[PDB]
Design a protein around this ligand. Structure first.
Ligand SMILES: CCCCCCCCCCCCCCCCCC(=O)OC[C@H](COP(=O)([O-])OCC(O)COP(=O)([O-])OC[C@@H](COC(=O)CCCCCCCCCCCCCCCCC)OC(=O)CCCCCCCCCCCCCCCCC)OC(=O)CCCCCCCCCCCCCCCCC
Ligand SMILES: CCCCCCCCCCCCCCCCCC(=O)OC[C@H](COP(=O)([O-])OCC(O)COP(=O)([O-])OC[C@@H](COC(=O)CCCCCCCCCCCCCCCCC)OC(=O)CCCCCCCCCCCCCCCCC)OC(=O)CCCCCCCCCCCCCCCCC
Ligand SMILES: CCCCCCCCCCCCCCCCCC(=O)OC[C@H](COP(=O)([O-])OCC(O)COP(=O)([O-])OC[C@@H](COC(=O)CCCCCCCCCCCCCCCCC)OC(=O)CCCCCCCCCCCCCCCCC)OC(=O)CCCCCCCCCCCCCCCCC
Ligand SMILES: CCCCCCCCCCCCCCCCCC(=O)OC[C@H](COP(=O)([O-])OCC(O)COP(=O)([O-])OC[C@@H](COC(=O)CCCCCCCCCCCCCCCCC)OC(=O)CCCCCCCCCCCCCCCCC)OC(=O)CCCCCCCCCCCCCCCCC
Ligand SMILES: CCCCCCCCCCCCCCCCCC(=O)OC[C@H](COP(=O)([O-])OCC(O)COP(=O)([O-])OC[C@@H](COC(=O)CCCCCCCCCCCCCCCCC)OC(=O)CCCCCCCCCCCCCCCCC)OC(=O)CCCCCCCCCCCCCCCCC
Ligand SMILES: CCCCCCCCCCCCCCCC(=O)OC[C@H](COP(=O)(O)O)OC(=O)CCCCCCCCCCCCCCC
Ligand SMILES: CCCCCCCCCCCCO[C@@H]1O[C@H](CO)[C@@H](O[C@H]2O[C@H](CO)[C@@H](O)[C@H](O)[C@H]2O)[C@H](O)[C@H]1O
Ligand SMILES: COCCOCCOCCOc1ccc(C(C)(C)CC(C)(C)C)cc1
Ligand SMILES: COCCOCCOCCOc1ccc(C(C)(C)CC(C)(C)C)cc1
Lengths: 486, 52, 65, 56, 68, 97, 114
């Protein structure tokens, strides 16, 4: 059986395990050496109830743009981290006793529970694909639908309170995202992005020596322009502070930052003077920084990200939804808080973003092979091995989820992913009949990301316009056109 | 309350509106007139290019 | 080529619907066996103590006595 | 209905087979396919006209 | 006393109930459709009279013999 | 070509008898014998009359002597005890504490 | 804080009493009886009784029952059993010595405890 088949190679596996541990140690040393000087400090923050940490990718998932590492090497890093996770049953005899060998036997029974060393294959890509096709796709295919249902019922709420909890403008997008297994039509990622309307406006407060300022597209454009100009720091900081005071005046004319009038957040006013400390009409006591002149406004280097996720936040998800998201992403989930599973999910998210960056450095998706792209999509959890799609469809799927994960929101990511895991079984043998049309094929051009899409009104859905029909499409798609024709 | 025992799919059908008309309308609203005449020139020169 | 989002059944798909019906109607079947058993258990019962009783029925559960 | 009376008559017979009633089923699939047919015929006529112009 | 939702059996939408199956070509089988198969005893009534007489008599004989 | 274990029409015909029960079909049909031969009417009267009967017997005659007597005189004395208890001359002819 | 909820008609109460009266009307509809074979002893004044004219309804439902109309009467002989045994016991002759030694449920009997 597989027990004796794996026991036969158990002696030959320890050397490979230790070699992999050495590679992991070297790689983590290198990566942390880079991270400890280029990456900022994402402080730990606690949930609304202030008992457990909460995690978000915008702050904690950092991408080393400029990482001198091969994509296959990063795949090795992540896969060996998962192998370290899978090596945990070796501690059972060292905590239970000599009778703690039966857990090790159960571990050695199934090959999917095991690390890389017990596999006959050599290449990391073929090895990962074997593991997925043997164990991982099956485990994910039995969690996908029930996670989709939990996400639905998290939006719409329980016990017939949809008229109190759902929104009437995201309705058609909700239907297209969650009930496309009924129609068989493809989905547009922008309709999944429309789910963020349940949340508020995500803001970024830059902390200065006087007051916090809300970041805008204009200020960000100016800062990117100044950073691209490659000026001396005496001019760089001056231009940055000029843009900063300009934006400060702009928001002061707007009526202050958006955070002042949001439930759960707020900026305090000047402190009050109590009793005899009140000096006539001056009932307030301004801060020390009020003495500083406004022309000396300088950025402290500190930032505060506020997703304002009132319905989407991972804190309010629950004990079950987090565990099922980690099952669906093949992460550890048992016997841990939702904060620890949140961190595991954010680490996976960061890995996927770093992998996207390295692919873009290595020349995009088309430079990859077919098996490598299949394994990438399996890691992204948008493909099941019982599909056998084309290369253009795989590339379009990757582009879709890459743009969707660029927004840094796990809820919409899971809503997108779970749609590709709704498979049925027929009770009859003759039905379903053999189709007559060819397989579904697409291209990178069919994905509309460079254009905005308004939310369709309820019970008034609009047809899908191809990007090619837009004006100047041959100009906008020229990069993708050159990449595909080449 | 008796919504399940009816068929109002004909009472509520998807509209036949083409969003491309609103897109070209926003394109013309953003573009000036001399660029429209330039585009007529681009088309004419493309016709002569296909001819030659 | 087959139609998409279709597959053969697997063990983790659970039992069929007819099997779920056969699971559901087992309590309804045992009802007919247990309600007569309830009536017989009540009717063929005898009290355990009287004013004259020098002894009371004892039931050693674990045989410790 | 009778003079000074109204009544309800029920038959007494075992029904060996069900009684069928033609309730036509509304579906959008035939009109979908006919729309596809018309659009494809439009494009085919368009291609024929364009070939006739380009070659003649 | 009670709201209309409780009276009508639904808060917002009345759900369809699957009708009862009929099994064309045979009688219904329910707890109330059993007299079709089991009528009151009518076949052995005269035997009942005879056997009651004989049972009474034989019992009385053996009881009197035991008592005596 | 059904791939599932198709259940016969007669098996469905029999299961319908078991799953087409209603609440009143259980309540009244099982409660009538229960109420009649239960702790209210018959079994209760029997089993609660026995307690008073054998209390009176063990007080007046003794359980050993009662067991030694004949079944006929046993039943006679039991009937007398039942009459004394039903009468309840000491409670003012009232079965209350 | 200021949700502005519209009134929900399902939360009103305008059907419970009508439904109860419908059930009661269905009940009383089975009290309809013909003139032939009709007799009801009125009161001494000549006015009708209360329980009298609402026996036909109950027995018309007993007619429609299946098991209770053949089972629930088997507890009725027990009433006559009590009627007879009570009269036997009202004047039963008993031994004075046994009554003085073992009175049934008498107070201050130390053999009982009080
Ligand atoms: C038997 C006696 C044996 C004694 C053994 C002592 C020696 C053995 C071990 C030594 C202890 C070592 C230190 C340690 O274990 O710290 C653990 C733990 C974490 O320490 P930490 O690392 O400093 O945490 C820092 C941050 O929290 C880190 O944040 P994080 O993101 O990493 O994860 C945070 C997560 C912790 O993450 C985990 O630790 C994972 C735990 C699972 C793995 C095990 O949450 C918590 O911090 C837990 C705080 C507990 C309060 C929160 C509310 C709990 C509600 C419980 C359910 C509702 C109760 C019933 C309601 C009905 C009544 C109204 O510290 C504890 O608070 C332990 C408390 C354990 C008892 C909780 C019982 C709650 C229910 C009581 C009901 C009422 C009866 C009591 C009155
Ligand atoms: C055995 C396996 C142990 C391994 C750990 C268990 C699984 C991991 C886990 O539970 O996370 C720890 C859990 C974290 O929960 P979470 O995943 O962050 O979910 C929070 C979500 O926001 C919540 O999201 P959610 O809404 O989806 O989840 C709600 C869930 C959340 O609840 C849970 O977290 C349950 C988690 C399962 C715990 C397993 C318990 C199994 C017990 C058997 C060392 C400990 C020394 C002290 C021991 C004595 C306490 O249910 C509840 O809220 C109710 C919980 C309380 C149920 C029991 C209530 C009994 C009431 C009795 C009547 C009281 C009347 C008196 C009233 C007085 C007047 C006021 O934190 C802790 O409970 C303390 C951590 C360290 C000890 C954990 C184990 C013992 C305490 C439990
Ligand atoms: C405290 C907890 C703090 C950290 C929590 C994290 C954690 O513990 O992860 C466990 C972890 C759960 O899996 P995961 O981390 O969610 O990742 C799953 C993978 O993604 C793969 O996911 P998957 O879907 O492919 O599933 C893999 C499959 C196969 O999993 C395997 O790797 C092979 C099966 C190993 C079974 C080991 C449990 C043996 C139980 C004792 C049996 C009797 C022993 C002999 C007689 C004594 O999982 C299973 O079939 C069952 C796994 C859970 C078994 C129960 C483990 C008990 C953990 C102790 C804390 C909870 C109780 C409180 O268990 C393992 O999978 C590895 C074995 C862990 C050995 C830990 C040794 C320390 C045990 C302390 C005992 C405490 C007992 C207290 C109550 C008595
Ligand atoms: C009774 C019905 C069965 C009882 C089952 C209860 C399970 C308890 C449990 O697992 O706790 C973990 C569970 C949390 O575990 P988790 O981190 O969410 O992970 C779930 C398992 O890993 C999910 O299980 P899994 O997918 O990892 O499958 C493996 C598992 C499943 O296998 C088994 O546990 C049992 C094997 C036999 C059945 C197999 C059928 C197939 O076996 C194991 O190796 C670990 C179990 C130890 O604790 C609770 O949810 C709390 C519920 C129990 C407390 C409620 C209140 C109790 C009364 C309180 C009195 C004082 C109040 C004042
Ligand atoms: C008279 C009491 C009930 C009158 C009204 C109730 C009624 O008749 O409903 C019919 C009701 C049910 O109809 P069924 O199916 O004919 O019952 C079977 C007869 O009991 C089966 O017995 P049978 O009536 O066919 O004949 C048995 C025969 C037995 O002959 C003997 O050996 C008795 C010798 C006595 C000296 O006894 C007699 O015929 C006359 C002798 C006096 C009895 O039958 C009776 O209750 C009358 C007989 C009951 C006698 C024992 C009652 C305790
Ligand atoms: C003891 C079994 C009861 C025998 C009742 C005979 C019968 O078929 O039942 C028939 C009788 C009455 O028959 P009618 O249709 O002639 O009135 O009882 C019933 O209708 C329902 C009996 C339910 C209890 C079943 C056990
Ligand atoms: C009158 C004084 C004030 C007290 C008022 C409250 C009294 C409550 C006690 C009477 C309860 C009657 O309870 C009654 O149960 C039946 C089930 O048989 C419910 O019945 C409901 O559900 C069933 C199925 O489950 C539906 O088919 C039905 O249409 C619906 O009415 C009634 O809606 C409820 O009214
Ligand atoms: C004033 O009312 C006195 C009547 O109360 C009799 C108590 O009966 C106990 C329950 O009786 C039933 C049985 C079935 C039902 C129905 C038929 C409504 C059950 C249902 C809902 C499953 C169809 C209702 C009550
Ligand atoms: C489940 O709850 C419904 C139970 O309702 C029982 C109501 O009980 C009262 C019925 O009793 C009567 C009273 C009067 C009458 C009739 C006598 C109305 C008067 C008549 C026939 C002379 C007009 C009939 C039955």
């Amino acid at each position: 059986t597989a027990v004796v088949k794996n026991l036969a190679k158990l002696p030959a596996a320890t050397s490979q395990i230790l070699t992999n541990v050495s590679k992991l140690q070297t790689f983590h040393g290198l990566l942390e050496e880079r991270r400890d000087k280029y990456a900022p400090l994402a402080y730990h923050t606690y949930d609304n109830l202030k008992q457990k940490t909460t995690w978000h990718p915008i702050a904690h998932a950092w991408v080393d743009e400029g990482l001198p590492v091969s994509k296959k090497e990063y795949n090795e890093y992540c896969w060996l981290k998962k192998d370290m996770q899978r090596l945990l049953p070796l501690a059972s005899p060292f905590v239970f006793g000599i009778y703690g060998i039966l857990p090790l036997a159960v571990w050695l029974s199934n090959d999917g529970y095991l690390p890389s060393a017990f596999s006959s294959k050599k290449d990391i890509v073929s090895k990962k694909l074997e593991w997925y096709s043997s164990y991982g796709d099956d485990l994910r295919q039995q969690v996908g639908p029930m996670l989709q249902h939990r996400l639905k019922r998290h939006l719409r709420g329980t016990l017939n309170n949809e008229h109190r909890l759902m929104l009437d403008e995201v309705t058609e997008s909700y239907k297209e995202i969650f009930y496309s297994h009924y129609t068989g039509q493809l989905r547009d990622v922008r309709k999944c992005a429309h789910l963020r309307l349940y949340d508020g406006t995500s803001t970024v407060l830059l902390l200065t020596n006087k007051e916090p300022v809300e970041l805008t597209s204009e200020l960000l454009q100016k800062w990117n322009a100044i950073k691209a100009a490659k000026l001396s720091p005496e001019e760089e900081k001056k231009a940055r502070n000029e843009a900063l005071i300009e934006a400060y005046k702009e928001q002061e004319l707007h009526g202050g930052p958006h955070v002042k009038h949001m439930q759960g957040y707020g900026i305090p006013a000047d402190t009050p003077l109590l009793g005899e400390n009140a000096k006539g009409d001056q009932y307030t006591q301004p801060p020390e920084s009020a003495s500083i002149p406004l022309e000396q406004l300088e950025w402290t280097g500190d930032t505060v990200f506020i997703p304002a996720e009132y319905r989407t936040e991972m804190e309010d998800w629950g004990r079950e939804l987090t565990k099922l998201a980690n099952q669906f992403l093949l992460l550890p989930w048992r016997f841990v808080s939702n904060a620890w599973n949140q961190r595991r999910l954010v680490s996976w998210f960061e890995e996927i973003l770093q992998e996207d960056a390295l692919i873009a450095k290595e020349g995009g998706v088309q430079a990859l092979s077919d098996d490598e792209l299949k394994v990438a999509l399996l890691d992204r959890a948008v493909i099941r091995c019982d599909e056998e799609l084309t290369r253009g469809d795989m590339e379009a799927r990757y582009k879709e989820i890459s743009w969707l994960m660029s927004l840094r929101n796990p809820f919409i990511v899971l809503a997108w992913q779970t749609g590709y895991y709704r498979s049925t079984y027929s009770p009859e043998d003759d039905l379903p009949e053999a189709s007559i049309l060819p397989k579904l094929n697409r291209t990178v051009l069919d994905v509309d990301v460079h254009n905005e899409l308004a939310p369709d009104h309820p019970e008034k859905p609009l047809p899908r316009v191809h990007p090619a029909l837009y004006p100047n499409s041959h100009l906008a798609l020229a990069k993708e056109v050159a990449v595909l024709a080449k | 309350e008796e919504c399940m025992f009816k068929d109002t799919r004909l009472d509520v059908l998807p509209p036949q509106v083409n969003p491309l008309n609103a897109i070209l309308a926003q394109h013309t609203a953003q573009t000036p007139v001399h660029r429209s005449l330039e585009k007529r020139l681009w088309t004419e020169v493309r016709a002569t290019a296909v001819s030659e | 080529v087959p139609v998409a989002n279709f597959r053969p059944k697997k063990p983790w798909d659970g039992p069929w619907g007819i099997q779920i019906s056969q699971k559901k109607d087992r309590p309804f079947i045992a009802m007919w066996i247990l309600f007569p058993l309830l009536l017989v258990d009540h009717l063929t019962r005898e009290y355990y103590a009287y004013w004259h009783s020098s002894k009371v029925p004892v039931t050693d559960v674990f045989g410790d006595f | 209905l009778m003079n000074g009376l109204k009544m309800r008559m029920f038959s007494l017979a075992r029904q060996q087979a069900p009684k069928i009633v033609h309730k036509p089923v509304l579906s959008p699939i035939p009109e979908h396919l006919r729309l596809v047919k018309n659009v494809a015929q439009v494009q085919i006529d368009m291609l024929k006209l364009l070939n006739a112009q380009a070659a003649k | 006393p009670l709201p209309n939702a409780v009276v009508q059996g639904y808060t917002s939408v009345r759900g369809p109930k699957r009708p009862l199956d009929h099994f064309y070509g045979r009688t219904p089988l329910n707890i109330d459709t059993l007299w079709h198969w089991v009528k009151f005893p009518h076949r052995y009534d005269n035997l009942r009279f005879a056997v009651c007489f004989w049972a009474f008599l034989v019992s009385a004989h053996f009881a009197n013999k035991k008592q005596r | 070509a059904p791939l599932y274990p198709v259940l016969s029409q007669a098996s469905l015909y029999k299961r319908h008898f078991f799953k087409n029960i209603k609440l009143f079909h259980v309540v009244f049909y099982v409660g009538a014998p229960c109420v009649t031969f239960g702790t209210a009417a018959w079994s209760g009267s029997n089993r609660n009359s026995r307690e008073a009967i054998f209390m009176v017997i063990e007080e007046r005659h003794g359980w050993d002597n009662f067991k030694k007597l004949s079944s006929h005189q046993q039943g006679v004395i039991m009937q007398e005890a039942a009459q004394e208890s039903l009468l309840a001359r000491n409670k003012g002819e009232l079965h209350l504490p | 804080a200021a949700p502005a909820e519209k009134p929900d008609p399902a939360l009103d109460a305008t059907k419970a009493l009508p439904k109860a009266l419908e059930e009661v009307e269905f009940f009383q509809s089975y009290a309809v009886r013909r003139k032939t074979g009709f007799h009801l002893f009125n009161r001494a004044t000549g006015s009708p009784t209360i329980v009298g004219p609402m026996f036909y309804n109950l027995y018309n439902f007993v007619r429609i029952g299946r098991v209770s109309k053949y089972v629930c009467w088997l507890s009725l002989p027990l009433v006559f059993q009590r009627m007879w045994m009570k009269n036997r016991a009202t004047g039963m002759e008993y031994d004075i010595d046994l009554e003085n030694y073992a009175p049934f449920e008498a107070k201050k009997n130390p053999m009982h405890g009080h």
